[PDB]
Ligand binder design. Structure first.
Ligand code: ZN
Ligand code: ZN
Ligand code: ZN
Ligand code: ZN
Lengths: 352, 352
């Protein structure tokens, strides 16, 4: 293609990252060429890296929470002008001609191409944002809002829209609503920020008192309930408009469906690889919903970023240099990060 | 109270009906006193009768698809004028002061009182529509539309709104939609009528070729698929906007979720007493909904009846006299009815 980049790749299920040089494509008519400033780390990167889901193709450059600079723009693009600080999410392509793609629900396209570990329309293995540059179709790039900081808008490109997409789709953008956040991972954490920011009563549900300081002090949730403290669990019995169910492992749905009121939704966003249960007469009891959501579209990623700027959301990111990415992976695995990690990619890896 | 009626009650789990005389209440300020013309039979009546659900209180007069005449009206009622042919559904009371009752979603009230087998606000056991009369709170009575026949509007009071309530709530009243009707019971049968009448492509799904003539000839569904004929089951793989899941026993949800397109709903309306399964990454795949619905409110029962008159729906009812109710129960059990049963209650049971 048109020139080379170096970035840090994984090349076996041990997931240890070391520099890897590769060729980027020629900036085609619709493409946008980006000089990556920083890239965020989150568990997807930890999962594909070490294989885990049994489907990793190596060499693999992670990073899907990308924010950089348009240095070059394809023959047709006009949204972006060179110089613009832009950002790239989990996807880099879709078929553009099926009903999800026309509806601007391209994350739901059957033929979506992922940031890395996939293969693009030209036959090339997609590589992440842990590199000094990337070329991305203009449809999968977003202008990061003006006051917004780069390492700030990078968690927001992944966990931001995963929460804001349902909160916007299920009509839950309304002030007043009562929500539960079951699970305090990354998506959970953002749940308590975007929900609380939309004007919602946010109750964080867990299983131990470890996330009390986090949910109540650092997240500002209105009270914390242990999913096993039956006293307070029953006072909640028909008060919640929705539940953002974030737990990745198998759990009983019925205790959480129980907190829900008439027409209440349980939005599931952790992948439980084993079939979850529900007792059918209780969904009938409250015209309750069991649903799910896969990330966000690009229209919603604009919306969400704009929203967090307006409402001034601020996650507590920890910015590390690229030689630290392996210990940063060890710690993100042992949950030793003070909430999020952002790799400063202008803390470079020059390897021609 | 104020006078006696005779009707036919069940008095043990054998469910055999024989005349039973009892006292109706005094028409209180909000109450409406009705002279029952005809009453429909459906499986609820067959279930409570023979106990089945382990909770029947005897003596028990069935019938919850009631249409009769207001002979007397309480001190405050003004909707109804004596002479009006009215109808009564599954419920006869609710708390009137909780959020479902204010929202006009009274069927979802925690404190709803059922037609029979329950106990009313005055302490009296509620008794059905298999009697020559009943007194009902004005809130649980509906004016049967003008051209509409009495034995016609009686199936419609139960199976009508059970279908029309979700079809109206989930925004599925729109022409064009593709729906599946999984299960051809009573609710299923009405599904294929109200869906087809709203301007939908109706595909009836089953497990054998017995309901072909019924679904295609007598119901006018657009094609029939055996849920096990994998060839045609896979050509349907992302075409349906919704599924009215009507099967009362445990079944795999995932084959039926598979027919659904982006944002497709599976509306469950048969009570599976054992927890149904779903693989969580596929709901995430299509932002698919698993939901349920318990009958309809009274506003929706007006709407629905008015709708079936406008669209001229006509179920094939079989009108029997009250001495036939036991053989009619035997046959409704062996599914020997040419679709619905209606007991002519002006084919009387005088027993003082
Ligand atoms: Zn991420
Ligand atoms: Zn597409
Ligand atoms: Zn019925
Ligand atoms: Zn109520």
């Amino acid at each position: 293609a048109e020139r080379k980049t170096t970035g840090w790749a994984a090349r076996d299920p041990s997931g240890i990252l070391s520099p890897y040089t590769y060729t980027l494509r020629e900036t085609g008519p619709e493409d946008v060429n980006i000089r990556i400033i920083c890239c965020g780390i989150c568990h997807t990167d930890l999962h594909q890296t070490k294989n885990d889901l049994g489907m990793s193709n190596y060499p693999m450059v992670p990073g899907h929470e990308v924010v950089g600079e348009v240095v070059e723009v394809g023959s047709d693009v006009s949204k972006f002008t060179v110089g613009d600080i832009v950002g790239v999410g989990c996807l880099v392509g879709c078929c553009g001609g099926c009903s999800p793609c026309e509806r601007d629900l391209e994350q739901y396209c059957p033929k979506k191409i992922w940031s890395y570990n996939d293969v693009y329309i030209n036959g090339q293995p997609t590589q992440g944002g842990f590199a000094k540059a990337t070329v991305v179709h203009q449809k999968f790039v977003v202008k990061i809002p003006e006051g917004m900081a780069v390492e700030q808008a990078a968690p927001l490109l992944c966990a931001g829209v995963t929460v804001y997409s349902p909160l916007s789709h299920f009509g839950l953008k309304q002030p007043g609503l009562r929500g539960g956040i079951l699970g305090l991972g990354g998506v959970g954490h953002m749940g308590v920020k975007i929900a609380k920011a939309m004007g919602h009563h946010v109750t964080v549900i867990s299983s131990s008192n470890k996330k009390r300081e986090e949910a109540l002090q650092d997240l500002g949730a209105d009270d914390y309930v242990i999913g096993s403290d039956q006293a307070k669990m029953s006072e909640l019995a028909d008060s919640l408009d929705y539940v953002i169910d974030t737990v990745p492992v198998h759990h009983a749905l019925e205790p959480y469906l129980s907190l829900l009121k008439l027409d209440g939704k349980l939005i599931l966003m952790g992948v439980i690889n084993n079939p979850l249960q529900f007792l059918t007469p209780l969904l009938m009891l409250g015209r309750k919903v069991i649903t799910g959501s896969f990330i966000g579209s690009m229209k919603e990623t604009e919306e969400m970023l704009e929203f967090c700027k307006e409402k001034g959301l601020s996650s507590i990111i920890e910015v590390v240099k690229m030689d630290y990415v392996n210990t940063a992976f060890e710690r993100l695995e042992k949950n030793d990060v003070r909430y999020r990690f952002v790799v400063d990619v202008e803390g470079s890896n020059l390897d021609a």
